[PDB]
């Protein structure tokens, strides 16, 4: 199965987050889908880096530190 994040919880999360910026907003279904696709892609990429990161630290267990490094390498600040 190709399931990553379940659609409905993801939609609810998007609406909850959007609530803070502007109220009574609506989304095109395509807009939520694009958001989800990018979110999954971003998280999966972070995890790939994380695996590499752990591999060179001689760890089999990935840590929050690994994720943080993967983010820095992409310029989040």
């Amino acid at each position: 199965t190709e399931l990553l994040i379940r659609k409905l919880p993801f939609q609810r999360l998007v609406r909850e987050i959007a609530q803070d910026f502007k109220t009574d907003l609506r989304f095109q279904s395509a807009a939520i889908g694009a958001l989800q696709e990018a979110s999954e892609a971003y998280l999966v990429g972070l995890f790939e880096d994380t695996n590499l990161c752990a591999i060179h630290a001689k760890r089999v267990t990935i840590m929050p530190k690994d994720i943080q490094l993967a983010r820095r390498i992409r310029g989040e600040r």
Binding site: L3, R6, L8, R26
Partner: peptide
């Protein structure tokens, strides 16, 4: 971890623009 749960696997209509409003 891979079960299909149609209730959770479908977007719902609430909060969504359907099918005609300003796009």
């Amino acid at each position: 971890d891979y079960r299909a749960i149609p209730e959770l696997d479908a977007y719902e209509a609430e909060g969504l623009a359907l099918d005609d409003e300003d796009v």
